[PDB]
């Protein structure tokens, strides 16, 4: 009753729009989504209440683990004969006195085995229990749990110690793991009971194939089409029928009419049989203007665009009158139509509005059931008669050359052109294609989607199609694959094989491809919502990725409604998310004042204003005692205003410092430092840092310890976000305060026997960033955007642009003599040294490794075409990595290409 109203106010604060605004949406799909999605909410809540309190603690503090338990050979070599030295802390009695217990145990020990050994070492002091029964009431390993010292990360599940990311990181970085022994009931009491209630809104024919007609759509008239009548002569509505991004028939234009009276009243006839309309078929249209002329070819220009699903969410072929409010053209539309554009009516009703009428067949026309589709596919099945079409092959028509040809085709990258010969070939051998499952994306593109006979047969292949790798399945969720049977199969592969580690890794892409879904309620959204509601680490980022796009009206409805369903069932975390949302709001409003009102003032004056505004009661309270949106395991305690400052970077970002209120903060970090940036789109850096992380993981598995630094970056809104401060790091320019300056600095920071490890870490990190930046075509490097850690770890910051941002393949990271001197340990002939030869071998090995995983990187960029990133608008942008990775060329030709690009950039050496 009263509790619903309170919850509605909390959800409203979280999503940035009131819940009541969803209640007033008349669209039945919106109301059905809101109602129907609640079953995912029920399901998720039940799984959390299954084995309470542990199942609830597993939701709140899920194990931060690697996908595979298996440790690479060079990582195992860092261990002392397969054993790890672990420190276990116990907070005991008054004065909260900390007591450490250092243990030497097998890397694959279960946390309960780790707890047992710690209590044995604690008990060892009492030499009485030591001899007779060392157990001490079965060491009550079930009465305690291990927590990471300095952050809210627990070891609640039976995994091997080394599989937990904190431990693997400790091994790799040569750091001592510090864990805190905590009583189970101390954590369980912190965990509040989940009181999920259903909202008040929870309470509230002929077949397509029996229509022997071609498709017709009526264009009536347009309103709100205001244009300079002195400039423009006439206007017209351009239309087309599409399956995803590809047309199913030729485009049909209306008659040209003067803009003073846009009233066509024309029935446009399409070259498509109504039964041949695929499930995902859409009407794509646009209002264009035509003028000119100068005696030269006419001047066409799109004014506004709009896309419609030819079938509604209930499988009903759209009928009757319909009005579509159009969208404004985005810069760089290489056609008069925008089929990759969002399907639907513009929420702003004071925009061009085209009135349409569809056909009516004296009955509700519905898309056929799978029983009708199966029967038709089975029905669609002499020796020489198969020879009449290159698109069909009979019983035993699979040669050994053709089998190897299909294998060769499946290897090729997603951006590789499949010829029409290859499309007929793939389709004719579709039944053999089942034996090579990974070929599915190629075979699907070979289908004639404007043929019900082919599509029905393809549907039966997809039904009994063997599972493919999650990474291979993700391609099938991009814009190229609109069919629900194909997309449904892809979601089913992720449900079965995607680990929560990998889901967290690829969550940005999965959130993006939701935008390519025809309907609000689909298999993908249900999959992602259930995962977000059964894992709070996933849920946190699911919330922020959706919230960061709420300002974009192309996705605000879908994302708003999805966020509402999330908030209604996430539990206690809503209260915590709201603290973060308010904290961000105060930082946005404060930085907005500094960019608008106080921009033309000195740092002393600006800082005076910052300090005064921060010390305000409402501000102080809002901005302290919340969880870092960058990593919600990090508690941000009280602000250290003396350590906070306005940065000298443009867009004047705030450098913020909070106390870490963890009892063992000293063993991780006492102060949490974050850069709040207002002015830059953080999405490009977010995707680059994700790719860097993936590249590093590839190299590590292959046995190349090339340490990268994919620091934390999170977009929280329209050109607003957070950036992780890398501790003990400085830019090359701030080091230079000659060529030996950098090497001399690292020598002083790493004196004695540690020197050789610092040079090694420098060379290795340098090699990783050299390869990564060249492949990705990152923005040009310089002394202010290259940083070095005290230990010697080199890394880059502020990516900004990737791929061909110039608009012939650049080398962003040119190694000056400064870097080569450090590499060669202070040598005269920097080129001809064993240290440089070692360094080159690292770059070559790293280059080829990424070449082998090319399909993943192409696919991660492809799924990202949905977001409005300026340098990632078409598949031609993505094609830059086809060039840098030299995919058309051979492996030896690729090394020669890489060597030549490095040779030309550095003026010799390679
Ligand atoms: C002091 C300054 C040179 N700086 N800038 C950044 C940074 C600031 C803004 C950024 O924007 C992007 N995209 N990467 C960025 C990196 C950064 C950082 N992360 N860590 C440390 N210790 N110092 C940093």
What is the spatial distance between Cα 733 and Cα 715, in angstroms, rounded to a whole number? Answer: 28
Candidate of 687, 797, 799, 869 to mutate for ligand 1, largest count of ligand atoms within 8 Å of Cβ = 797
Dihedral pair phi/psi, residue 411, rounded to 5°:
-65, -40
Structure tokens at 785: 């955007």
**Alpha-carbon separation of residue 724 from 672, 712, 721 (angstroms):** 9, 5, 10
Task: Please state the three-class secondary structure of 661-711 as a single string.
Answer: CCCCHHHCCCEEEEEEEECCCCHHHHHHHHHHHHHHHHHHHHCCCCCCCCC
What is the spatial distance between Cα 813 and Cα 822, in angstroms, rounded to a whole number? Answer: 16
Candidate of 644, 656, 675 to mutate for ligand 1, largest count of ligand atoms within 8 Å of Cβ = 675
In the reported structure, the alpha carbon of residue 737 is separated from the centroid of ligand 1 by a whole-number distance in angstroms of: 19
The strand pairing partners of 720, in sequence order, are 678, 717
- 879 neighbors 863 (Cβ within 8 angstroms): no
Cis, peptide link before residue 53, omega less than 30° from 0: yes
Which ligand 1 atom sits closest to the C-alpha of 734? Answer: 3
What DSSP state is assigned to residue 282?
E
**Alpha-carbon separation of residue 674 from 311, 390, 713 (angstroms):** 48, 62, 10
How was it solved? X-ray
Q: Is 346 exposed, middle or buried (0-12, 13-18, 19+ CB in 10 A)?
A: buried
- 218 neighbors 285 (Cβ within 8 angstroms): no
What is the spatial distance between Cα 572 and Cα 575, in angstroms, rounded to a whole number? Answer: 6
- The region, left, alpha or beta by phi > 0 then psi within -120 to 50, assigned to residue 711 is beta
Structure tokens at 407: 């294998």
From atom 13 of ligand 1, which residue's Cα is the shortest distance away?
A: 798
Neighbours of 48 (CB within 10 A): 22
Taking alpha carbons only, the member of 712, 683, 705 closest to residue 842 is: 705
- CA within 13 Å, CB half, 810: 17
What is the spatial distance between Cα 674 and Cα 653, in angstroms, rounded to a whole number? Answer: 10
Given the structure tokens 């090497």, which residue do they identify? 743
The CA angle 559-563-569, to the nearest 5 degrees, is 155
In the reported structure, the alpha carbon of residue 796 is separated from the centroid of ligand 1 by a whole-number distance in angstroms of: 9
In the reported structure, the alpha carbon of residue 798 is separated from the centroid of ligand 1 by a whole-number distance in angstroms of: 7
Q: Is 803 exposed, middle or buried (0-12, 13-18, 19+ CB in 10 A)?
A: buried
Structure tokens at 67: 């996908």
Per-residue burial over 122-135, b if 16 or more Cβ lie within 10 Å, else e, is: bbeeeeeeeeeeee
User: How many whole angstroms from its chain centre is CA 24?
Assistant: 32
Q: Is the shortest distance between the CB of 157 and ligand 1 below 6 Å?
A: no
User: How many whole angstroms from its chain centre is CA 116?
Assistant: 40
Dihedral pair phi/psi, residue 804, rounded to 5°:
-85, 75
Structure tokens at 753: 């026997």
**Alpha-carbon separation of residue 178 from 60, 85, 148 (angstroms):** 21, 10, 7
Q: Is the shortest distance between the CB of 709 and ligand 1 below 6 Å?
A: no
The strand pairing partners of 237, in sequence order, are 287
Which ligand 1 atom sits closest to the C-alpha of 799? Answer: 13
In the reported structure, the alpha carbon of residue 723 is separated from the centroid of ligand 1 by a whole-number distance in angstroms of: 7
In the reported structure, the alpha carbon of residue 725 is separated from the centroid of ligand 1 by a whole-number distance in angstroms of: 6
From atom 14 of ligand 1, which residue's Cα is the shortest distance away?
A: 798
Structure tokens at 383: 């020796």
Q: Is the shortest distance between the CB of 729 and ligand 1 below 6 Å?
A: yes
Structure tokens at 283: 């009407």
From atom 15 of ligand 1, which residue's Cα is the shortest distance away?
A: 798
Dihedral through CA 77, CA 79, CA 80, CA 84, nearest 10? -170
Three-class SS state of 905:
helix
Which ligand 1 atom sits closest to the C-alpha of 725? Answer: 20
Beta-carbon contacts of residue 278 (< 8 Å; ≥ 6 apart)? 243, 248, 449, 450, 452, 455, 483
In the reported structure, the alpha carbon of residue 806 is separated from the centroid of ligand 1 by a whole-number distance in angstroms of: 24
- The region, left, alpha or beta by phi > 0 then psi within -120 to 50, assigned to residue 67 is alpha
Query: In the chain, which residues are last before a break of more than 2.5 Å from C to the next N?
Result: 204, 381, 737, 807
- 616 neighbors 639 (Cβ within 8 angstroms): no
Orientation of helix 484-497 relative to helix 452-463, angle to 10°:
10
CB pairs under 8 A, 24+ apart, for 784-788? 784/731, 784/732, 784/733, 785/731, 786/731, 786/732, 786/813, 787/726, 787/729, 787/730, 787/731, 787/732, 788/729, 788/730, 788/732, 788/735, 788/742, 788/746, 788/762
Q: Is 895 exposed, middle or buried (0-12, 13-18, 19+ CB in 10 A)?
A: middle
Q: Is the shortest distance between the CB of 797 and ligand 1 below 6 Å?
A: yes
Which ligand 1 atom sits closest to the C-alpha of 711? Answer: 19
Cα R_g (the chain), whole angstroms: 31
Q: Is the shortest distance between the CB of 711 and ligand 1 below 6 Å?
A: yes
3-state DSSP percent of the chain in helix, strand and coil, to 5? 45, 15, 40
Instruction: Tell me the residue length of the chain.
Output: 910
Q: Is the shortest distance between the CB of 552 and ligand 1 below 6 Å?
A: no
What is the spatial distance between Cα 840 and Cα 350, in angstroms, rounded to a whole number? Answer: 61
What DSSP state is assigned to residue 466?
P
Taking alpha carbons only, the member of 555, 565, 571 closest to residue 201 is: 565
What DSSP state is assigned to residue 220?
E
The strand pairing partners of 794, in sequence order, are 788
**Alpha-carbon separation of residue 300 from 221, 249, 340 (angstroms):** 20, 21, 20
Q: Where are the alpha helices (DSSP H) in 703-791?
A: 732-735, 741-749, 755-776
Cis, peptide link before residue 293, omega less than 30° from 0: yes
Tell how many helices (H) and how many strands (E) occur in the chain: 35, 27
Q: Is the shortest distance between the CB of 725 and ligand 1 below 6 Å?
A: yes
Structure tokens at 468: 């493919």
From atom 4 of ligand 1, which residue's Cα is the shortest distance away?
A: 725
Q: Is the shortest distance between the CB of 723 and ligand 1 below 6 Å?
A: yes
In the reported structure, the alpha carbon of residue 405 is separated from the centroid of ligand 1 by a whole-number distance in angstroms of: 50
- The region, left, alpha or beta by phi > 0 then psi within -120 to 50, assigned to residue 320 is left
In the reported structure, the alpha carbon of residue 643 is separated from the centroid of ligand 1 by a whole-number distance in angstroms of: 16
Beta-carbon contacts of residue 710 (< 8 Å; ≥ 6 apart)? 689, 690, 692, 693, 696
Which ligand 1 atom sits closest to the C-alpha of 677? Answer: 9
Q: Is the shortest distance between the CB of 798 and ligand 1 below 6 Å?
A: yes
Given the structure tokens 């030896």, which residue do they identify? 892
What is the spatial distance between Cα 674 and Cα 626, in angstroms, rounded to a whole number? Answer: 13
Neighbours of 775 (CB within 10 A): 24
């Amino acid at each position: 009753n009263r509790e619903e109203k309170i919850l509605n106010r909390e959800i409203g604060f979280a999503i940035g729009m009131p819940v009541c605004e969803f209640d007033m949406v008349k669209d039945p799909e919106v109301q059905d989504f809101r109602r129907n999605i609640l079953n995912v909410c029920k399901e998720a809540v039940d799984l959390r209440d299954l084995n309470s309190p542990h199942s609830r603690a597993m939701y709140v503090y899920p194990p931060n683990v690697e996908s595979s338990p298996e440790l690479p050979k060079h990582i195992y070599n860092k261990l002392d004969k397969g054993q790890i030295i672990v420190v276990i802390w116990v907070i005991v009695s008054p004065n909260n006195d900390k007591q450490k217990y250092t243990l030497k145990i097998n890397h694959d020990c279960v946390p309960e085995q780790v707890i047992a050994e710690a209590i044995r070492k604690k008990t060892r002091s009492m030499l009485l229990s030591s001899e007779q029964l060392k157990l001490c009431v079965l060491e009550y390993q079930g009465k305690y749990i291990l927590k990471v010292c300095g952050c809210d990360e627990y070891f609640l599940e039976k995994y091997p110690l080394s599989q937990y990311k904190y431990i693997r990181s400790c091994i790799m970085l040569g750091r001592m793991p510090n864990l805190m022994l905590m009583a189970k009931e101390s954590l369980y009491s912190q965990l509040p009971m989940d009181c999920f209630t259903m909202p008040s809104y929870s309470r509230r024919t002929k077949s397509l194939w029996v229509i022997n007609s071609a498709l017709r759509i009526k264009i009536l008239c347009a309103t709100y089409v205001n244009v300079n009548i002195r400039d423009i002569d006439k206007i017209y509505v351009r239309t087309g029928i599409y399956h995803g991004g590809e047309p199913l028939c030729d485009n049909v234009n209306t008659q040209r009419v003067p803009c003073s009276n846009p009233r066509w009243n024309e029935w446009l006839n399409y070259d498509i049989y109504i039964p041949d309309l695929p499930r995902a078929a859409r009407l794509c249209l646009s209002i264009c203007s035509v003028k000119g002329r100068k005696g030269a070819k006419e001047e066409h220009c799109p004014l506004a665009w709009g896309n419609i699903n030819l079938f509604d969410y209930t499988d009903t072929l759209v009928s009757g009158k319909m009005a579509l409010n159009l969208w404004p053209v985005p810069h760089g539309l290489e056609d008069l139509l925008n089929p990759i554009g969002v399907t639907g009516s513009n929420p702003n009703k004071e925009t061009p509005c085209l009135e349409l009428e569809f056909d009516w067949f004296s009955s509700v026309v519905k898309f056929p059931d799978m029983s009708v589709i199966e029967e038709h596919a089975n029905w669609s099945v002499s020796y020489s008669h198969a020879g009449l079409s290159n698109r069909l092959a009979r019983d035993n028509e699979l040669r050994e050359n053709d089998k190897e040809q299909l294998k060769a085709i499946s290897t090729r990258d997603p951006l590789s052109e499949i010829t029409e010969q290859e499309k007929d070939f793939l389709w004719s051998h579709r039944h053999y294609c089942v034996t090579i499952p990974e070929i599915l994306p190629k075979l699907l593109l070979s289908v004639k989607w404007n043929s019900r006979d082919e599509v029905a047969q393809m549907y039966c292949l997809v039904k009994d199609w063997p599972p493919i790798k999650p990474e291979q399945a993700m391609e099938l969720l991009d814009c190229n694959y609109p069919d629900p049977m194909v997309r449904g199969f892809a979601v089913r592969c992720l449900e079965k094989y995607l680990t929560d580690d990998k889901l967290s890794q690829y969550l940005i892409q999965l959130v993006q491809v939701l935008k390519y879904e025809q309907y609000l309620d689909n298999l993908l959204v249900r999959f992602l919502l259930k995962k977000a509601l059964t894992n709070q680490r996933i849920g946190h980022f699911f919330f922020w990725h959706l919230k960061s796009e709420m300002h974009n009206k192309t996705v605000s409805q879908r994302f708003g409604l999805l966020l509402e369903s999330y908030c209604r069932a996430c539990g206690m975390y809503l209260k915590h998310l709201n603290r973060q949302v308010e904290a961000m709001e105060k930082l946005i409003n404060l930085t907005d004042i500094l960019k608008q009102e106080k921009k033309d003032e000195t740092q002393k004056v600006q800082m005076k204003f910052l300090v005064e505004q921060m010390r305000r009661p409402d501000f102080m309270d809002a901005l302290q005692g919340f969880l870092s949106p960058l990593n919600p395991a990090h508690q941000l305690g009280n602000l250290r205003l003396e350590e906070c400052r306005i940065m000298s970077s443009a867009k004047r970002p705030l450098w913020l410092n909070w106390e870490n209120p963890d009892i063992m903060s000293e063993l991780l970090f006492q102060n949490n430092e974050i850069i709040f940036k207002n002015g830059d789109d953080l999405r490009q850096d977010m995707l680059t840092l994700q790719i860097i992380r993936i590249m590093e993981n590839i190299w590590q598995n292959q046995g190349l310890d090339l340490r990268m630094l994919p620091y934390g970056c999170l977009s929280i809104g329209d050109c607003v976000g957070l950036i992780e401060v890398v501790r003990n790091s400085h830019t090359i320019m701030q080091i230079q305060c000659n060529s030996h300056t950098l090497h001399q600095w690292l020598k002083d920071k790493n004196k004695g026997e540690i020197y050789d490890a610092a040079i090694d870490l420098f060379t290795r990190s340098c090699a990783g960033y050299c390869v990564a930046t060249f492949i990705l075509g990152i923005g040009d490097r310089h002394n202010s955007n290259i940083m070095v850690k005290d230990d010697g770890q080199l890394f880059h910051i502020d990516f900004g642009h990737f791929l061909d941002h110039k608009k012939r393949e650049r080398v962003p990271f040119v190694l000056t003599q400064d870097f080569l001197i450090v590499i060669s340990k202070g040598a005269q002939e920097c080129t001809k040294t064993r240290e440089f030869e070692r360094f080159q071998e690292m770059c070559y090995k790293a280059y080829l490794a990424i070449r082998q995983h090319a399909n993943l990187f192409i696919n991660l960029f492809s799924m990202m075409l949905g977001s409005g990133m300026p340098e990632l608008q078409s598949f031609d942008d993505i094609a830059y990595i086809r060039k840098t990775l030299a995919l058309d060329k051979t492996e030896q030709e690729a090394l020669e290409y890489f060597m030549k690009q490095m040779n030309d950039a550095h003026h010799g050496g390679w």
